[PDB]
Design an enzyme around this catalytic site. Sequence first.
Site, PDB file in Angstrom:
ATOM      1  N   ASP A  39       9.509   4.824 -14.951  1.00 14.81           N
ATOM      2  CA  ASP A  39      10.519   4.683 -13.910  1.00 14.81           C
ATOM      3  C   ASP A  39      11.459   5.884 -13.922  1.00 14.81           C
ATOM      4  OD1 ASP A  39      12.625   3.529 -12.149  1.00 14.81           O
ATOM      5  OD2 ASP A  39      11.548   1.652 -12.488  1.00 14.81           O
ATOM      6  N   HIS A  69      17.624   2.455 -11.981  1.00 17.62           N
ATOM      7  CA  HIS A  69      16.447   1.623 -11.732  1.00 17.62           C
ATOM      8  C   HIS A  69      15.683   1.352 -13.024  1.00 17.62           C
ATOM      9  CE1 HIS A  69      13.154   0.887  -8.414  1.00 17.62           C
ATOM     10  NE2 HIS A  69      13.819  -0.218  -8.711  1.00 17.62           N
ATOM     11  N   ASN A 161       7.651  -3.268  -1.527  1.00 14.75           N
ATOM     12  CA  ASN A 161       8.690  -3.977  -0.788  1.00 14.75           C
ATOM     13  C   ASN A 161       8.595  -3.725   0.713  1.00 14.75           C
ATOM     14  OD1 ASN A 161       9.646  -4.590  -3.418  1.00 14.75           O
ATOM     15  ND2 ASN A 161      10.876  -2.716  -3.399  1.00 14.75           N
ATOM     16  N   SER A 224       9.887  -4.209  -7.480  1.00 15.57           N
ATOM     17  CA  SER A 224      10.273  -3.405  -8.626  1.00 15.57           C
ATOM     18  C   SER A 224      10.940  -4.256  -9.700  1.00 15.57           C
ATOM     19  CB  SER A 224      11.211  -2.294  -8.156  1.00 15.57           C
ATOM     20  OG  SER A 224      11.116  -1.141  -8.966  1.00 15.57           O
TER      21      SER A 224
HETATM   22 CA   LIG Z   1      14.991  -3.507 -12.378  1.00 11.03          CA
END
Ligand SMILES: [Ca+2]
Length: 279
Positions: A39, A69, A161, A224
Amino acid sequence: AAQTNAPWGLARISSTSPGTSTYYYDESAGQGSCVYVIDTGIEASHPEFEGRAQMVKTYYYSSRDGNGHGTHCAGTVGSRTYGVAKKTQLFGVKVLDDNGSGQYSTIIAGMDFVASDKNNRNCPKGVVASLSLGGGYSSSVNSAAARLQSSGVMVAVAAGNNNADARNYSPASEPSVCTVGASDRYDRRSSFSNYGSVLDIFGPGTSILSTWIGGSTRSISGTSMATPHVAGLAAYLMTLGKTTAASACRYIADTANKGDLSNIPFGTVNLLAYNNYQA
Ligand SMILES: [Ca+2]
Ligand SMILES: [Ca+2]
């Protein structure tokens, strides 16, 4: 173990019913497993990681998570308060810059990094990779995810998404990895969650409270966010010996809460990740 007033997602993964607030889990809590969080990096110094998180690789000038994130998803995997596997080891692979973007080649390199780097780590209970990233379809990104899975890593990837069929997204569309859709606290498919036959499992994805950079916390939504629930669950189950990396996605699917989600399109699995823990 019983964590009261846990994030709804944690409570949900240990519950046959929605709307409860205590997270139940075997105290082994993923100890001896490792989860790579591929990530934006991990703020390893966050008190919630208790020293179990570390950056192992970056493709940018810093291994720091300047985005949040990756810290958030690492928190959902294994932070003490917001994590599924509260004793797992967290390895940060920063393939996304602090804007949360990464070239496919970098992402592919990071995935191949993990398949090799796990041989530098002590994960006797097994290795998981949480890929909370998504882009358009790419056979090369899919193949890198397939290689990572093939190497003995339980690969959990976000379905995406786009409220679309995940067949057009990578690594979501790679069949051999665990493609995770998002659900909300009322057991609805998250409005944004991708769907389709390639989806293997749903995890909590809407309003997921977890760690954030600056030593903070925040709640955000996305497939996510469902992915680290399943990644943390896999590490937890592997530590319990109930499955291996190669079979964890099938095992999670077999032991999932079935037919409990609403607004799951025809042909998409109606499976909600479930640790099946009986206190
Ligand atoms: Ca997260
Ligand atoms: Ca799959």
